[PDB]
Every structure is written in structure tokens, then in C-alpha cells.
């Protein structure tokens, strides 16, 4: 009666879904009772302090357990053969063979090998001792308590922001580009040049002697005079040893390209010139928008004035600004679209260009860090369309949006969905049809009859980037071209030595197994958008239900009438895509892992023979690489893989429990509970006990969510168990 | 009044029902009056023994007796598990006398019986002097355990140890 | 009362707290409930900097045996990390009594026995205050390049005015 303090319509609910919907729409601030728009923005703003204070408490937790239970000071000296340590184990359910099988890495008690790879990130930003890691933990624990107290104070009625403070899109975007992006990256080059550059050269720059160590031997004199190439005079050599001064070099902003020879990481010096360069650009781009000083650009005159003539884009972008500034789901949907793509861009650019020292030698770290930021990118990208579909219901105004590009989206909305449905159907026909054709040719003993289309359009790009394995001799494989000859002292010889090395992940050599799987990724990208863009466009109505906007975003159905309307809502159009999302990111991570297993084992032909047909995906990647995983515990004994063996069956269990909420639906279960209510109310001596919230079955929309969560958690825990234990089992 | 710190208010349940509302309840643990009857005696009885405990050792640290950490495991007569059969069952009779004194009538401390107030003690300014001596006696006992855990010497001579060096010789170890 | 004879921005141009000088180009003198806090924080950032500057150029004619960056940690009576909870109590104990009511320097823990200075002596303490804060940031930038000593930049600039300046050190 009291727990949904936000929804009194749930407080009058005598059933047990009062508990379930007190949890799930507690952060749906736009539908709480008595919520106003000034009250809306203040709870969102304090909650962002709540997310920030969790992140810094989380990161200070990583700094603490590494400093206390980890072997970072032992891993510094030998960063190849010593395995990293996440946090020690105290499980009193263990047995004695399960204590000694988890003692590894040279430690005392049982430990977990950290596959998150925060050692490689910390080792290259200057962390060398555990005493440097406790200080970072106590620092972020202070900073996390600052953001806890800030979210409390910015709710207090003296310090509550005005409503016009939030809608100032000029001043925020002027401060976050210049200060939060520019000055922060300017300060991070300050951490690189002062601390992280000379720490690799074997020179301790701590808080005690950073005001005594010059970063450069003639420091601040080229910056004030002009000869900025003096900062790139004697760089880290080709025989540098990371962490020592053996062949050290003295440059602070070098522009080499390619990799360090030992670590096979990016150079620290061009990472300093990188974050310096975009710091200059973000500060310069942070002086664009008209806030309070008479100069700058108004957002209300850039959108509306870019209307092309002859009716190409309707009324142009006219009137969008009041539908971006006032709407939050439009702002959230753009942000999840941007962050979700530059989360993949993090993942796509860290296996090929590993930025931290002795990464892409630790293989399980590389496997986890790619697969993590792909599913993190996968969930964020489908939420961009989810909160894009909430925009068309809760925030869209057709009278405000007469004829702009946003309404022309809803105007030709069937042309969008039918052309996505053609591309998704063409790809699924002709990618599966080629694999089945290849599988039959493997089954009939004749591999020569396969369809093996060479990836010409991507090998043309790799040869244009400088990969002379294919011999297109086009631009950078062409030695007499222009772009090869405009950069032989600038940035090319490091980059061209780094591609033509066959044993890094920088522009891997590709064959027809990679033709087929990128089209399968293209299938999975176009079909996941087909489900989601249909969920955005048909959120306001279809011919089956022309008033879908009157019910809201997340409703069960519209009854059995009109032929039956199971899964008609835009929520139910969003949730189907999460299956096709996890499929798609499952396809990008199967292909990433198995091309990297065959690269790191050395049998690079074992992929290209077997990736052309789907049995080789099964009997050479799933069957073959799960040999030591499932042997984590057996009646002979157990080893260090048993925690990943147990999770691998734990993941199959949550997955299949997800089908129970997906195949069985609600009304089989509500009748079953009605027998349990009877058998409770008629049982002697249990009639002493009676419930408060009446037991009812989980609602239709809830059964979607609970089943998708069991589907997705069991999906993630299964593959992460297979990813960590197949990599680290043989490595 | 100056409760515990300037500026701050005493919370609404500290209305001087117990004498001396000193405003010190940051966890709001004086709201329930059924519990507040117990927490009065919890502030008494944790100091009723600890007053005589701390004077009883500060009399007898450096006179003729060993450390109270080793006074228990000293070789006495008729080993103390048999004396625990005395020293639990006899004091349980005292708690059995006082069990009808917690709840029904006569809140403990200020009862003043004839052999227990033979001189006729009195009203205010003599209730606070019994009150104030009980606070820092409780603060003594969690000092003396921590004074002996950090410095293995005698707690009398720790006073001379702090007078030998107020700067370096501190609690700061 | 102009920073330059071009403009006089605020609605707080007439309303003063005996510390007015007429300069606010960014907009932090316009919320009327907070100038009771802006002017006091400008005062207290000055008053804690006045005692600083007296004890920075003070040991220039006086003792050279203390250094500057080591002056925060020498062999004191207590250890330097051990004398800190004396600082957490005693400094705060007068601070809270300064905070009481904030009634425009209410004489609660800083009673002045008298001396009140209702005319321009209040503005002169502001101008001494708004120049003592520039004094401390002078003492902790040009020294803070680990080049000049407690204070030897003025004694250098009296020797080499057109020589030793900002763009002429360019060394360690």
C-alpha cells in the first residue's frame, strides 16, 4: 500500500505485481504522480550524480583489490609469463582440491586471473607500485563521495536548478566540448608528458618530484619560440625496453605510427600528441555556439535554415530545435546512438591498434575487452531506437513538426521498412544459401564446388592502406604513388611496417570465409534495424491499430480482436530485436574470436579452410575449442577452469529458463496459481499463514522482460565462459 | 543550551524526559520509547560497572598486581571453569532480583533503598555528577584495551610516556 | 567607479556592501540572494590571504634558514602529519563561530575592541584584500616554477629590470 510512492495507481493494487511494477517503472520519471517538468529535470540531474558516484566507487574498487589482493608489483617486472590477478577468493564452500587449483600466478591463496586487463592500462599510464594504486583508490573514493554529496545538495531547495538552466543547450555544449572534452584531454596529455612518458623511460615522476623533473631537457622553450619539432628529436628507439632507460630517447610528442617493438602497443609519444591535438580542436570547436557574449552560433538558426530547395527534404530541419530541446527521449536516443557507435569504435580499434603495453600478447584480455565493448555497444545501440520509439509516442508533436525531415520520416515510413525488409531478406537468402551450398559440397566430399567469393572490395582497401599481400599496388602498396611519397618522414614507415607484419591484428588477411561473415554481420545489422525502425515508425499506429499512441509505449496487446494482436506494441517491437541483436553481436564475436584463435595458435589456414562452411564453425570452433572448458571438473579431478566450466552450464540454465517465460505465456500460469491459492487456503495449519499481496501471475509485458533477461544473462554467461576458458585454457 | 556542538538542534524525541538532553543522537536511536526505557539503563549499566572497573585498575596497575589481560589466565585455585559455575549462578540471582525491577516499578539507578542509600542522597547537580563520571569511565575502558594492545607497557606509565614526548609519542602509530 | 569608461553592467551597480568597484563581465553578481555570500567569500579569501602574505615576505628580511616548499614539512614539535588534528579542531572552532548567523562580520569569535570603520576604510580593506589575493597567486606561480626562492624575484628585477623577466628565465 506504501511501496510505490511514485505511482498511487500501483499503491491501490492488492496483488503481487505491485512489487514488480514498483521496481520497473521507478525510473520512469515522466509517469510518476505529480511530476512536473521542473521536477522532472532535477531528479534526472541528481541521478546522473548517482551514476557517476557508482562508477568512481566501482573504479576505486578495482584499484583497491588490485593493490591489496593482486600482484601488480610482481607483474610489472615480468609482464608476459606472470598472469594478472583480479581479487582473491574466500568461498567457504570450497574443498581442498578447489583451493590449490585456484592458487596460481605465484600468489598465496586462491585468486582470479583478471581478464579485464586493467593491469595493461595502469602499467602504461605510469602505475608501478601498489602504493601508487592505493592512492588512486582513496582518491576516487573521495571523488565518489563528492558526487554522492553533490546529488544530495543539488536536490536541496536552496540549490535546485531553474527550469531554464537545463534547456540552455548553448552553454552546456559550449562547456562540455571545450572543458569536459578539450581541457580534460589537455590535462591528460599533461599526465602523459609529465608522468606517463618518463615513467616508461625508467624515471619515477611521483607527486613528490613532479615539480623538479623537466619532461623535456629544453622544456617550454620550443613552445614559446616555435620549433615544435624539438619535442620529437630523439624518440623511443626501435630497441627500447618498456619500463627501463635502455635505449630510452628523450622526445615527448613524436608522430611515428605503428607499434612499439617490444610491447606491440601504440607508442606513448604519439598518444600524447593525439590527445593534445584533439584537445586543441575540442577547445576551438568549444567556441562555436552563442551563449551570452554576442558571438557564436544559435542552434535555432542552423537547423531551420538548412532547407534544400525544390522540396528535397520537405521543410528542411525547420522546427526540430524545440523538439530536441524539450524532448528527453530524443536527446537520450541520440546519445545512445552516438555512444553505442563509439563503443564499437573503441572495440574495433583496440584489437587492431592495442593502446596499452603488453596487450595483444595477453590473449584473454584481448578476447574479453573486445567482446565486452561489443555487447555493451549492442545494448546501447538498440536502446537508441528504443528511446527513439518512446520519442514518437510521448514527445512527438505533428503540429510543431509540420513538414520537417522528422515528419517526412513518418510520411514515407513504409518505404523505409520495406526497403530494409528487402535488404534483410536478400542477405539472409544469399548468405545462408551460400553456406548451405558450401556445407553440401563438404558433405559430398568435393570442396572445389564451393562458392568462395574473394573479398575484392575490402582487399582493395587493405592494399590502399599498405598491405602488399594481395598485390593491387594501388596507393600505399604502390611505392611510386603520391600518398606513399607525401609521408615517408611524416607517419608512414611505422604504419607500413606494422601492417605487413603477419602476426598482429592490424588489417588481418582475409579470404572468402570473411566475405560470407561480413555479409552475415550485414544481415544482422540490417535485420536488427528493421525490427527497431519499424518499432519507431509504427509506434504511433498501423492499419492494424491506428491509435497505438493512445495506449502508450509498453502495453501488452489490443486483444484477440482484429485477427489477434500479440506483440503489437513498440515495446514488444523493441524486445524482438534484442534477440536479433544478441544474434548479431554473437556473429561478430564468433568471427572475431575464431579468426584470432587461428591467428594466435598459428594455424591461420585452419580458419580459411573451415570458415567457408557452417560445419567448420561448429566442429572446429565450438566443438574443438570447448575441449578444456567442459573438462574443468570431471570425476578424475578439477583445475582452474572449473569456475568457467560451472558458469558455462550455469549460462545454459538461465538461457533455457528464459524460454519458460517466452514459450509458456500468462494464463496457463494464472490458473496454476489459483490452485495453489486453494491448496494454501484449505491446508490445515498453514491457514495460520496468509499473504498480504495477492499472488497473481506475472503480467504479459513482464513475462517479455523476465524472459528476455534470462535469455540475455544466460547468453552472456555462456559465451563469456567459453571465451575466457578457451582462450586462457590453451594460453 | 550547548548540547554537543553549536548551531544544531536536538531532535524531537530528546525533550528532557531523560535528564540532560545533550542532542547526541545522529542515528535517531531514541525514537521508540519502549526501547528508550532500555537505552537509559544501557547508558547507566555500561557505566555502573565500568566506573568501578577503571578506578579499580588505576588504583592497582603498578602496586602489586599484573596486567588485567593476564589477571584472568593467572594460576588461581580450583580452576575457573568451576569458579564460573559460581560466578555466573550467583550473579544471575542478582539479575533475577532486578528482573522485576526493569519493567514493573522503579527504574534502576535511582531507587535509594535503606542499605543502598544509607546517607540519603539528593536531587539535581548530584545526578549530573554521577552522570558525567560515567561517560569518560566508559571512554576509559575502550582506551585501556587499546592502550595495552598498542603499547605493551603499563597504562599508568603511558601517562609519563606522553609527558616524555607530546609530539611523537601519541596514539598515532 | 568604472573598470574603463565604457559600461556599467549590473543591477548591483548601485547596491553595495562597502566593497564596490564595478566589474562583473561574466554574470556572477546578479542573483540578489547570493551577494550576501559572494562578498563574504571574497572577504574571507582575502583575510586568510592577508595573514599569508605577511608570513611570506616576512621571512625575507627575517630568517633564511627556513626554505619555502620544505616549510610545510620540517622538524616541528609534533610531526607534520601528527599536528594536523590540532588544525582540524582549533581552526574549525573559530570558523564555526565566524559562521554564526553570517550577519555581515558579526562579532562572535572575532570581536574587535574600538574599530568598526563604516567609511571608505571598509573599501580600502577590500582593495588591500583584492590585491592580497593577487599577491598570493603571485607568490605561488612565479615561485612555483621551482626557480625563484622564498622571494628573490623582486631583488632580481631591481637588479635586472629589462633583463630577468618572465620570458627570460627559460631554464630549470
Amino acid at each position: 500500500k506504501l511501496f510505490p510512492k511514485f505511482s498511487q495507481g500501483l499503491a491501490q493494487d492488492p496483488t503481487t505485481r505491485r512489487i514488480w511494477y514498483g521496481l520497473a517503472m521507478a525510473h520512469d520519471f515522466e509517469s510518476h504522480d505529480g511530476m512536473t517538468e521542473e521536477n522532472l529535470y532535477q531528479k534526472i540531474f541528481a541521478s546522473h550524480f548517482g551514476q557517476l558516484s557508482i562508477i568512481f566507487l566501482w573504479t576505486s574498487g578495482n584499484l583497491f583489490h588490485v593493490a591489496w589482493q593482486g600482484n601488480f608489483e610482481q607483474w610489472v617486472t615480468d609482464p608476459v609469463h606472470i598472469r594478472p590477478i583480479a581479487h582473491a577468493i574466500w568461498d567457504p564452500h570450497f574443498g581442498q582440491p578447489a583451493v590449490e587449483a585456484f592458487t596460481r600466478g605465484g600468489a598465496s591463496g586462491p585468486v582470479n586471473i583478471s581478464t579485464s586487463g586493467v593491469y595493461q592500462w595502469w602499467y602504461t599510464i605510469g602505475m608501478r607500485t601498489n602504493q601508487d594504486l592505493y592512492v588512486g583508490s582513496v582518491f576516487l573514493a573521495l571523488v565518489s563521495a563528492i558526487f554522492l554529496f553533490a546529488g544530495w545538495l543539488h536536490l536541496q531547495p536552496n540549490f535546485q536548478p531553474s527550469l531554464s538552466w537545463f534547456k540552455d543547450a548553448e552553454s552546456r555544449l559550449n562547456h562540455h566540448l571545450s572543458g569536459l572534452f578539450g581541457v580534460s584531454s589537455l590535462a591528460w596529455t599533461g599526465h602523459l608528458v609529465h608522468v606517463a612518458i618518463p615513467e616508461s623511460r625508467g624515471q619515477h615522476v611521483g607527486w613528490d618530484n613532479f615539480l623538479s623533473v623537466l619532461p623535456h631537457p629544453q622544456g617550454l622553450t620550443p613552445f614559446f619560440t616555435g620549433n615544435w619539432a624539438a619535442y620529437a628529436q630523439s624518440p623511443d628507439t626501435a630497441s627500447h625496453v618498456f619500463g627501463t632507460a635502455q635505449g630510452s630517447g628523450q622526445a615527448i610528442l613524436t608522430f611515428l605510427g605503428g607499434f612499439h617493438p617490444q610491447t606491440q602497443s601504440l607508442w606513448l609519444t604519439d598518444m600524447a600528441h593525439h590527445h593534445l591535438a584533439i584537445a586543441v580542436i575540442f577547445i576551438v570547436a568549444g567556441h562555436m555556439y552563442r551563449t551570452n557574449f554576442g558571438i557564436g552560433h544559435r542552434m535555432q538558426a542552423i537547423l531551420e535554415a538548412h532547407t534544400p530547395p525544390s522540396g528535397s527534404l520537405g521543410a528542411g530541419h525547420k522546427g526540430l530545435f524545440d523538439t530536441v530541446n524539450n524532448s528527453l527521449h530524443f536527446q537520450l536516443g541520440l546519445a545512445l546512438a552516438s555512444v553505442g557507435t563509439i563503443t564499437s569504435l573503441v572495440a574495433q580499434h583496440m584489437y587492431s591498434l592495442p593502446p596499452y603495453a603488453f596487450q595483444a600478447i595477453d590473449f584473454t584480455t584481448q578476447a574479453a575487452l573486445y567482446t565486452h565493448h561489443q555487447y555493451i555497444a549492442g545494448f546501447i545501440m538498440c536502446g537508441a531506437f528504443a528511446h527513439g520509439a518512446i520519442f514518437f509516442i510521448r514527445d512527438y508533436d505533428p503540429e510543431q513538426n509540420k513538414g520537417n525531415v522528422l515528419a517526412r520520416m513518418l510520411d514515407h515510413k513504409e518505404a523505409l521498412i520495406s526497403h530494409l525488409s528487402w535488404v534483410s531478406l536478400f542477405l539472409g537468402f544469399h548468405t545462408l544459401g551460400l553456406y548451405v551450398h558450401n556445407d553440401v559440397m563438404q558433405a559430398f566430399g568435393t570442396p572445389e564446388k564451393q562458392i568462395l567469393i574473394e573479398p575484392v572490395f575490402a582487399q582493395w582497401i587493405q592494399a590502399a592502406h599498405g598491405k602488399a599481400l594481395y598485390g593491387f599496388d594501388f596507393l600505399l602498396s604502390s611505392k611510386t604513388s603520391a600518398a606513399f611519397a607525401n609521408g615517408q618522414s611524416l607517419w608512414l614507415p611505422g604504419w607500413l611496417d606494422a601492417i605487413n607484419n603477419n602476426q598482429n591484428s592490424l588489417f588481418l588477411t582475409i579470404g572468402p570465409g570473411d566475405f560470407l561473415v561480413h555479409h552475415a554481420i550485414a544481415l544482422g545489422l540490417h535485420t536488427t534495424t528493421l525490427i527497431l525502425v519499424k518499432g519507431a515508425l509504427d509506434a504511433r499506429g498501423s492499419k492494424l491499430m491506428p491509435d497505438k499512441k493512445d495506449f502508450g509505449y509498453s502495453f501488452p496487446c489490443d486483444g484477440p480482436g482484429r485477427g489477434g494482436t500479440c506483440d503489437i506494441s513498440a515495446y514488444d517491437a523493441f524486445y524482438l530485436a534484442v534477440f536479433w541483436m544478441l544474434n548479431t553481436i554473437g556473429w561478430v564475436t564468433f568471427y572475431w574470436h575464431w579468426k584470432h584463435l587461428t591467428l594466435w595458435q598459428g594455424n591461420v589456414a585452419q580458419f580459411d579452410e573451415s570458415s567457408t562452411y557452417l560445419m567448420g564453425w561448429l566442429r572446429d570452433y565450438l566443438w574443438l575449442n570447448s575441449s578444456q572448458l567442459i573438462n574443468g571438473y570431471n570425476p578424475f579431478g578439477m583445475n582452474s577452469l572449473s569456475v568457467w566450466a560451472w558458469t558455462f552450464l550455469f549460462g545454459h540454465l538461465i538461457y533455457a529458463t528464459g524460454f519458460m517465460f517466452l514459450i509458456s505465456w500468462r494464463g496457463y500460469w494464472q490458473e496454476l496459481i489459483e490452485t495453489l491459492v486453494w491448496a494454501h487456503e484449505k491446508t490445515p495449519l498453514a491457514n495460520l499463514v496468509y499473504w498480504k499481496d495477492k499472488p497473481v501471475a506475472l503480467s504479459i509485458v513482464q513475462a517479455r522482460l523476465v524472459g528476455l533477461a534470462h535469455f540475455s544473462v544466460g547468453y552472456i554467461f555462456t559465451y563469456a565462459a567459453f571465451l575466457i576458458a578457451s582462450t586462457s585454457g590453451r594460453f | 543550551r550547548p548540547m554537543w556542538y553549536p548551531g544544531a538542534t536536538a531532535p524531537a524525541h530528546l525533550d528532557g524526559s531523560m535528564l540532560g538532553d545533550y542532542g547526541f543522537d545522529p542515528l535517531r536511536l531514541g525514537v521508540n520509547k519502549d526501547n528508550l526505557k532500555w537505552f537509559r539503563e544501557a547508558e547507566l549499566t555500561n557505566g555502573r560497572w565500568a566506573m568501578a572497573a577503571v578506578v579499580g585498575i588505576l588504583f592497582t596497575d603498578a602496586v602489586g598486581l599484573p596486567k588485567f589481560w593476564t589477571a584472568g589466565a593467572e594460576k588461581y585455585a580450583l580452576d575457573n571453569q568451576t569458579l564460573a559455575l559460581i560466578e555466573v549462578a550467583v550473579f544471575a540471582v542478582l539479575e533475577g532480583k532486578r528482573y522485576e525491577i526493569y519493567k514493573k516499578t522503579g527504574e534502576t539507578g535511582f531507587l535509594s533503598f535503606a542499605p543502598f542509600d544509607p546517607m540519603g542522597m539528593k536531587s539535581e547537580e548530584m545526578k549530573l555528577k554521577e552522570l558525567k563520571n560515567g561517560r569518560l569511565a566508559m571512554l576509559a575502558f575502550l582506551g585501556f584495551c587499546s592502550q595495552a594492545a598498542v603499547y605493551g607497557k603499563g597504562p599508568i606509565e603511558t601517562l609519563q610516556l606522553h609527558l616524555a614526548d607530546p609530539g611523537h609519542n601519541n596514539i598515532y602509530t | 567607479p568604472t573598470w574603463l569608461p565604457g559600461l556599467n553592467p549590473p543591477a548591483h551597480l548601485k547596491g553595495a556592501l562597502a566593497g564596490d568597484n564595478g566589474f562583473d563581465p561574466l554574470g556572477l553578481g546578479q542573483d540578489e540572494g547570493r551577494l550576501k555570500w559572494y562578498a563574504e567569500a571574497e572577504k574571507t579569501n582575502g583575510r586568510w590571504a592577508m595573514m599569508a602574505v605577511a608570513g611570506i615576505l616576512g621571512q625575507e628580511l627575517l630568517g633564511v634558514t627556513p626554505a619555502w616548499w620544505e616549510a610545510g614539512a620540517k622538524e616541528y614539535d609534533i610531526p607534520a602529519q601528527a599536528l594536523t588534528p590540532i588544525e582540524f579542531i582549533v581552526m574549525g572552532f573559530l570558523e564555526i563561530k565566524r559562521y554564526q548567523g553570517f550577519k555581515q562580520t558579526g562579532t562572535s569569535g572575532f570581536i574587535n575592541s574600538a574599530g568598526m570603520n563604516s567609511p571608505s576604510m571598509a573599501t580600502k580593506e577590500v582593495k588591500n584584500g583584492r590585491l592580497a589575493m593577487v599577491a598570493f597567486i603571485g607568490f605561488c606561480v612565479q615561485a612555483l616554477a621551482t626557480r625563484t626562492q622564498p622571494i628573490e624575484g623582486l631583488t632580481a628585477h631591481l637588479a635586472d629590470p629589462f633583463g630577468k623577466n618572465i620570458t627570460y628565465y627559460l631554464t630549470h
Binding site: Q156, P157, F159 | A8, V150, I171, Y172 | P85, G92
Partner: peptide
Amino acid sequence: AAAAAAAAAAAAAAAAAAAAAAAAAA
């Protein structure tokens, strides 16, 4: 317990300022 008691004696003055924050905001 040097940095333990020094942080605790710092947390005493931090809690006393928190008693100033818990009143001056409302």
C-alpha cells in the same frame, strides 16, 4: 593506527561541517 586515527579525527571535523550542511540547506 596513525593514518586511521588521523582520518577519524579528520572525519570528526568533516561530520561537524556535515551538521552545518544538514541545517543550513533547509
